[PDB]
Design a protein around this ligand. Sequence first.
Ligand SMILES: OC[C@H]1O[C@@H](O[C@H]2[C@H](O)[C@@H](O)[C@H](O[C@H]3[C@H](O)[C@@H](O)[C@H](O[C@H]4[C@H](O)[C@@H](O)[C@H](O[C@H]5[C@H](O)[C@@H](O)[C@H](O[C@H]6[C@H](O)[C@@H](O)[C@H](O)O[C@@H]6CO)O[C@@H]5CO[C@H]5OC[C@@H](O)[C@H](O)[C@H]5O)O[C@@H]4CO[C@H]4OC[C@@H](O)[C@H](O)[C@H]4O)O[C@@H]3CO[C@H]3OC[C@@H](O)[C@H](O)[C@H]3O)O[C@@H]2CO)[C@H](O)[C@@H](O)[C@@H]1O
Ligand SMILES: [Ca+2]
Length: 446
Amino acid sequence: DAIPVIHYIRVTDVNPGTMIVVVGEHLGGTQKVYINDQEVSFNRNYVTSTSIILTVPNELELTGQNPELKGEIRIETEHGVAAYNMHVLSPAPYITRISATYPIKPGDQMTVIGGNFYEVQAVYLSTEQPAKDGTRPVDVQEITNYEVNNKYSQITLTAPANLLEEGYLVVECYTSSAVTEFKKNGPKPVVTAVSSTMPVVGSTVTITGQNFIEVSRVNINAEFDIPVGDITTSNTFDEISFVLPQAPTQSGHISVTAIGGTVESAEIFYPLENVILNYDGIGSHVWGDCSFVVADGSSAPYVSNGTCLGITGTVSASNYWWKQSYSNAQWVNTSIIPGNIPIDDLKLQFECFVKEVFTGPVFQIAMCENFDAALNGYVPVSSFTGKTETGKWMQCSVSLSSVVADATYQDFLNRNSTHIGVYATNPGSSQATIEVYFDNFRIVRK
Ligand SMILES: OC[C@H]1O[C@@H](O[C@H]2[C@H](O)[C@@H](O)[C@H](O[C@H]3[C@H](O)[C@@H](O)[C@H](O[C@H]4[C@H](O)[C@@H](O)[C@H](O[C@H]5[C@H](O)[C@@H](O)[C@H](O[C@H]6[C@H](O)[C@@H](O)[C@H](O)O[C@@H]6CO)O[C@@H]5CO[C@H]5OC[C@@H](O)[C@H](O)[C@H]5O)O[C@@H]4CO[C@H]4OC[C@@H](O)[C@H](O)[C@H]4O)O[C@@H]3CO[C@H]3OC[C@@H](O)[C@H](O)[C@H]3O)O[C@@H]2CO)[C@H](O)[C@@H](O)[C@@H]1O
Ligand SMILES: [Ca+2]
């Protein structure tokens, strides 16, 4: 006859799976228990006239994921009914990333991506992060227009006026708050790779990276800029290319300016001070059956930096002495590459042009008359693509140790020989015809 009552609950906020104690009166004869409008099992033995002990089910459907559910525990006795409000906590929100079209202008739509976006109370931008208490920084930029999707995984919102340039985006939920970095212009661009360190004038330079968005400047070694209209950028914003209109007269790096900022290439671009043979005053050819060409725009490698070496013709099968160039190199000064640098930390680079792929013919590269240490059976391949490119120039790169057996660069220098040699042969079973050009042999750091 007495009406059941609930005075309080001991452990109003509660996690699924945890034990609770319902304290009140006239509860001795509870028949049924419910939480969030869902039937919950309980044990009769933990029931007294003044207390119910049960555990909030782990798999209980929460009010966070279904707004139709009343956030209360309901008790039914033999005759009466009692209810008390309590909040079973949803999992904490997290933010993976922001999906946006940069730059973000006020009023533009962006999408916050993450999970457990239950019970979103507020969304704001801030120059600094909220406290671990969820305590919210002094100055913030409230985002008034936002919508959460049905999966509680995405918040689509519109950008406020007077946008923060840099800082954080915060999703404020009942359980806690989630934070991620926010930049209205997006992340700084990045450079992964460059097609070459010494591309031939008139040929294509290609740059790999990310966030090449609205590229406004490409600066070469702080000497000159590429006219923006002559810069092609890929749809996916991860590749830049352009024709090199002139040779730099000083080494440096390539700087790329995009919406997200400016970034420099890591490699040194046009390391003229690292060149050892270019057939244009650095080093010199001495003897050998080969050719030397200045490209004329209509044939051969079409373009060239001054004179370049040519090894062309048809090679009989099993020809172990065909065409070659024996030259005197001008090794890199120690002012640039210190004597104590290991050979293992150095690489030989050169520009190569292959008219057409071939099968059988190979190249030998030798230095300082140490043919024991020479590079043998080498087929030119691009350091950029890994393939044997044809009909255009490519950068070829090999570890210097594959040509030099010495330990440090000074040991190499102590041989006091300026010999560099390129030898073409055909150990192949079938004859073949080739047309290959070489220029700008250079030694640089790995
Ligand atoms: O894979 C295993 C298979 O191997 C097969 O056997 C082959 C070997 O593998 C292969 O190594 C070998 O190569 C030999 C080749 O057979 C010889 O023909 C060749 O001859 C040249 C010689 O090496 C040079 O010394 C020489 O240099 C002269 C140059 O001729 C001259 O024109 C030049 O004149 C300059 C002058 O210097 C300037 O001052 C002036 O101002 O201008 C003029 C030019 O206008 O001077 C050069 C001087 O050289 C000096 O520096 C180097 C020193 O060694 C010299 O002593 C110095 O004097 O030119 C030779 C060219 O020979 C030509 O005339 C004679 C003919 O016999 C020849 O056919 C003509 O071509 O030498 C090669 C040696 O190779 C060396 O370099 C390449 C490396 O690969 C090798 O390790 C290293 O030893 O040939 C064999 C077979 O052919 C097997 O057959 C197979 O079965 C195996 O499976
Ligand atoms: Ca040259």
